[PDB]
Symmetry: D2
Subunit: 467 residues, 4 copies
Amino acid sequence: TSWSDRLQNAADMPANMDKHALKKYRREAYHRVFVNRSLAMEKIKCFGFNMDYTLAVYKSPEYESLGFELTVERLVSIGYPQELLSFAYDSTFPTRGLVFDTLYGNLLKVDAYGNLLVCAHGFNFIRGPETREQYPNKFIQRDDTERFYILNTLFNLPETYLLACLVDFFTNCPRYTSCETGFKDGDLFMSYRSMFQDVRDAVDWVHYKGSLKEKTVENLEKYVVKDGKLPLLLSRMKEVGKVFLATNSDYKYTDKIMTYLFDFPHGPKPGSSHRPWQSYFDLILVDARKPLFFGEGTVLRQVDTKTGKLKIGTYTGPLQHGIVYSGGSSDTICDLLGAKGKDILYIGDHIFQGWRTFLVIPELAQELHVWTDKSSLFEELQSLDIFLAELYKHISSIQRRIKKVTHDMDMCYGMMGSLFRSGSRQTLFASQVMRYADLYAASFINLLYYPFSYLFRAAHVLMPHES
Amino acid sequence: TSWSDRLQNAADMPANMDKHALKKYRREAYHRVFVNRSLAMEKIKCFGFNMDYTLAVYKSPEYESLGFELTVERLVSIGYPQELLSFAYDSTFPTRGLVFDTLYGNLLKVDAYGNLLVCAHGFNFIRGPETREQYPNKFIQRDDTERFYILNTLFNLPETYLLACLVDFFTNCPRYTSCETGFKDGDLFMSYRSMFQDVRDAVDWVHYKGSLKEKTVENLEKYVVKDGKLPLLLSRMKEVGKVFLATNSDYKYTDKIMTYLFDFPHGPKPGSSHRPWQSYFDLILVDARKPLFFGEGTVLRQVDTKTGKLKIGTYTGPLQHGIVYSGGSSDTICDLLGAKGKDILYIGDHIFQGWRTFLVIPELAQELHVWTDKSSLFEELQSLDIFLAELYKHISSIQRRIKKVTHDMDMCYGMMGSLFRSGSRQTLFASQVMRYADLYAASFINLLYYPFSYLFRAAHVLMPHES
Amino acid sequence: TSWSDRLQNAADMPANMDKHALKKYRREAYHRVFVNRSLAMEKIKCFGFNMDYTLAVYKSPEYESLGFELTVERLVSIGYPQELLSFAYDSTFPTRGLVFDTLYGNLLKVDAYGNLLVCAHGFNFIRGPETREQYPNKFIQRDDTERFYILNTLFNLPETYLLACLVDFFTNCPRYTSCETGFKDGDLFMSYRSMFQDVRDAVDWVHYKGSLKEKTVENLEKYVVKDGKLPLLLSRMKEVGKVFLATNSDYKYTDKIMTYLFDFPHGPKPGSSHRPWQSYFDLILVDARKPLFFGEGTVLRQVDTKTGKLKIGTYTGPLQHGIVYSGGSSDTICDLLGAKGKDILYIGDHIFQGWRTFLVIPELAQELHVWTDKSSLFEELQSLDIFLAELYKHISSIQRRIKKVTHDMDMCYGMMGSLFRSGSRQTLFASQVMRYADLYAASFINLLYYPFSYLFRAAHVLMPHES
Amino acid sequence: TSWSDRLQNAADMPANMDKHALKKYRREAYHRVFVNRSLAMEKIKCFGFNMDYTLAVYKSPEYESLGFELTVERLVSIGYPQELLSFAYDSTFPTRGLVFDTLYGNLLKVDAYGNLLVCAHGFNFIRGPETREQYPNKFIQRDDTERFYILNTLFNLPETYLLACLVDFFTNCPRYTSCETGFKDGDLFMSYRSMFQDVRDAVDWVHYKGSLKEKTVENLEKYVVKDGKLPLLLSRMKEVGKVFLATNSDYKYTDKIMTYLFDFPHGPKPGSSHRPWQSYFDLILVDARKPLFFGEGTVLRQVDTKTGKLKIGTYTGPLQHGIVYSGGSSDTICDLLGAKGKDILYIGDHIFQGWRTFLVIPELAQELHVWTDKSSLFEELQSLDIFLAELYKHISSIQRRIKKVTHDMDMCYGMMGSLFRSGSRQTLFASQVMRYADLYAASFINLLYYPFSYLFRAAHVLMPHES
């Protein structure tokens, strides 16, 4: 069961909206909204949305698999060897948030402080003594952005796997000779950095210039989760505040996707008349150019919605319906909606004054199921950790047991472990979720199970001396 | 009782070094080392020290009071009105870590996200509706470094108070007319920013060009804590690894201070021969120029210890005793000591690859005593917070009670509240301690009560969905 | 007669290489190499070449006209009104080096100090009092790169004209209302900056993603000057040093163009066997990414010349023939050729340690012919200028005569005047030629008329007090 | 005869102000204003002045000699060896504008393109083959500001000489061993960069914290040129526009100096009543902080002229007399004077929108006298250069004669040659004068010999192809 199977299983449920129905439903972890920082819902005046992996949850492993194959085909088409065509996408290998080391050709899982949790070269997992040869203190400086690339997004999933496949292919194929920083074909030296750049370029091309969008849109049932509860949540939000869409996609793609997502023989609830997806938003903005959108942005433009092209000129005046914007900035959205900063909840799949944030983490659906299965393994980890400290206070192969249990726990998630941790150690990714997302969940649909004056309450944080 | 009275009270204790003596002593909060991130002491190869507020704990309120009066006298001497001489330092007003808003002339206490916890203009505490006139969402952007200055250090204590005294003086004196961004004397407009810059300049002058050092050094008994347990801890550290000093002070000041700190009729333990302070360090570095020291540093120089002046030339070769360095960088120290990054524990009073860190927070001695007195007040705060969320889930003047209890709790610390929080809300400062200090305590002497293979163990951190 | 007609007329000449034939030929201005800074040819070890407008001189006005029409068609295709299709390229309007002011929608000709020489909004030439309304001291700051874009290159010729056509169209068409900073279509405001960005984007697209290259290469006789003297000069250079090509074009385009340029029934001289264009270069580098090429560059790659695609890997070793590189940097070229800086003459059409520089200015052929026709007009300008200063030393409508003669002289060049001056005032462009080009000429073929040990001699420069 | 003897000789002349008296006086080079760029004096609305080396011309070699000795004494006082006290300042060695290479300890004279004209290590002049060992193409990159320091100002004269004295001392003294990048005293290595930084620090200290100002002001007759024609020129300027002073000096120093400069028993002309120096300026600004003054500046303050200290507050309103400002910016001056950019002539000794510029070059007085003596030597240089090019066109020891004559010409200026050239090659400094100074002269007093509607006329500049 993929995480998107879990989302699609819950998506097939009709909404029972009775008071205690919604109450007993948000006991179940997969349907809860988790809280890093308290947030009074009653004080939210606008709800903003990204499209991709937020409203439009691409099905897994199919969509990753499509991205992977189109990227492989782009690499072959620009000169990569034919053997690449025999790769097939394996959803059990990649974990989101890995670091690619372009110097050595390794994928690294790290904590917030640069400590290495997992190191793999191709499909070989480096450990202990041999890791320290390339990572002296088992440490990487993540802000050496010229060397290390953080594979942070869900669109980075196929290329996470592809990079491993390639290092493995060049490392094991006898045409090639392995080096520390790349590989030779006869006297021809190819660095892992050049190779990483070709992949990155090929992923960009598939998205901006290749057939990814085209192939998605011809089979939306295969590639995109559809949930009848979407128009219901959005119409409920529009009762209590304004709703907006800000997406990086162009207008034609957004329209095709959004039309599919609202394509039910009904509107908010069954039995009601269907309405156009545009009717659910007070403001629709495409070609947003995030993350630049959140800074200086680009000039505000306006789409001719019959042609999908930009108008010559932009409607100057106040917010009125019918209009679709393009570019601009998040500050321009505030001005148009008449609401600033903490009055705004922005719901998206990516971790980037000051809007409140709801982070959708689609993997959380499967992570939650494994987490509860492993509870014993984690509890033992805590005990060993506690007992180890007891020994040092005043033979001591508790360390090897700690190493063993940590591996076992991790393998249940896939080869690169949990998104959020390796054994008792939190990932870079988990720390950034905690620092940057006020609220997070497997799906934003989970908001539907809470009343709109709900006070989301974070646990009181105490310093070590306060506890 | 000042925090430095607490440190000086514990400093008058001889060291009972029996096994269970040290065990039962580090139950008591004021003598514990607190742990943000686990640290195996057995793996530490070098211990590094800042001098000021670390080895040399300046007595409070006397030292702040000396800084304050010399700074006031500098301002008068450069053209400030005579009424400044009737100011007297009040240790109950300043809390460390306040933000001075140079636009409006307010001191602000803030959380890590920019939310205003406390706003005071002079000695008037702005609240609710009137705060929102200048701080629209009750929010400041701390990284607008041209407007906001964070009064982060213990040397900033007198000027925190001085800035308040000045705004209060100009605001209430009838020679002057108040404006939003400063004040007039007839047609003469003086901004709060100019005024803040004069104070900052005057504090710098007192330290670098005035009589602060001179007045300290003529009365060390009045201004500096002396603790006979210092040579004992340091000699214990030198048994298990290397010890170094890196200070911003010049050689003559360091020598005067360090000689006083080792001035006992004995060495490590009573009954042992006294030794020079220099014998306790494998490496001594002065004129360090922190924080530049931690980056590119400056060229490595060497002090002629009979004159206190730089030698022409620097000893190129390996670490040998007798030598005192000047300038250089933290990377140069690693090279000389033959140990990198996580092998090093650096002990200092200020929050700035990668050395482990022990943060000395002298105020923690008094904060800990108030914390335990207020436990009831905090517990009520938690209950109200929890009960408030219960109401919103489905008249509601729980908010006014929350506002009231928060004030009451805060006033026990002084007018600007606790260093670490305002009621249930953590300060910017507390967050930075948690992010940047592996270990922290009221005093580094607390290390003496733990065995040198101790494993300092942080609580396992769980994400909201893991708990 | 276009400048490229002049180049093509001289290109139809066979080379008479007798000693005094070449001597009497380089008396004639159009065949001379002009010298800003002395250069001993005997000391040059390598000759480097850009392709475009250097080896491959695109015919004018045809090539500009092709660029213009493909750019117009791109704008219409993305939403610009149909009336754009009735524009036709006018080679008499643009002068190279104009500044587009994106705030006001004006083309400006300026001197090196920011002084306005010519201001045109669409096809209306603003003068005197009305210029000072938008340019207070008749001055622009060229390094305000967000506002002002310098239309420096020969590829900028069509868009120089296009920008004028567009401002004129929107200004005179009654669908639209004129504003200071753009224009309205009803309530729709379009800024000149947005409009400039669309043009710039459309020019980029025509070059990188549209049919410009395709249409060039299907009719090379119409679009590119062919000169039988090219292989002769290059073979002469290869006798005395190394020859290299560094171009931004990809391999397939370069090969098509370069094959055409060497397509004669003969090699260096008539009667000799034809050889491949590649045989004339010790080093060939494509996808150079200038100007980044001159700094950090990109990784050095290698082209598979049978497919036109990059090889996986790059030949590590010393320079050997057969190899074609891609990317890299100018420092990598030096390493490969074994010659640095002043040992290298780089021949190109664009003004960008330290290679010597030969600047090809194709317009110089027509500018030289007008210059000599206007000699009287310029001489009068000097006299009026001198006589004006005589009056002020001690009614004075010498200023209006100076204004009149300056206009008359300028109109002989086209509407925006000479590339190098407006009357007695030198352009920004002329100053940059003098500062940055050691040698310059209408064509690099002019090198053929000088012996290869020639000492190019600049006039001794004297300061005003030395003269 | 020093350059300041020449200025003081002309300063002893009374002003004969008859029409043709002033006409025949500005035939003589030493009394002319030279013109790089034309400037209509009739269009100038404000005249701005720096103080130092502009209004206050420090006598040479005395003032350099005072700076030198106080700097030497500062170095000894901070640990430099006693032998430094036996240095004596030699005004024949330094030429302004030399580059100190902190890597190798050489002074370099360079042209605008980085070409080495003169290289000296201590007092040894490196030539030919041995220069190329450290400067591969005889070239330095001046914008490598971490390595190369340009000794641009007249205050840099003593330290130019001092740096040479020191390299010579450490190189020839047998306590020390020479290295490529510094020198050893036993095992102690001292780099030339550290040594350069100590000198630079010591020069700064002498100026800001030592006795330079004090020693100047106690003997103004010895250190500062006094010219009775100063009040006359300034009063003439104030007839036709506004006059302002912007200086980096504080108020007390400025007042002492300016009082001395106006200390005559008369005002503008003999026979007229004396007036205070302040009466000659519409605006007086001290503590200007140039060059920051020309950018963002610092806050505008106001001096209490009875105490010399800053007022608390600044007079907000329009320009009125009596007021003395401090800090601020050049934009603030424009606002106060009601005149922008090209309406302003700024007269100073240093080469730094857009004020017109008059550069005072005190050395020009002696340079002009040598220039005319060497006219033959330069004319031969031109002939050899021309004849050399004639040979290469088609044994050739014209090069050694060119090398010889160039040396001979140069030695007439002092050991480091002319400020403006080495033989036929212009210095970096000469190029910057030509690029940045509209007008220049040995003294600004030269303005007195031109009528105030004079049109300063630059020679028409032609490109090589236009001539």
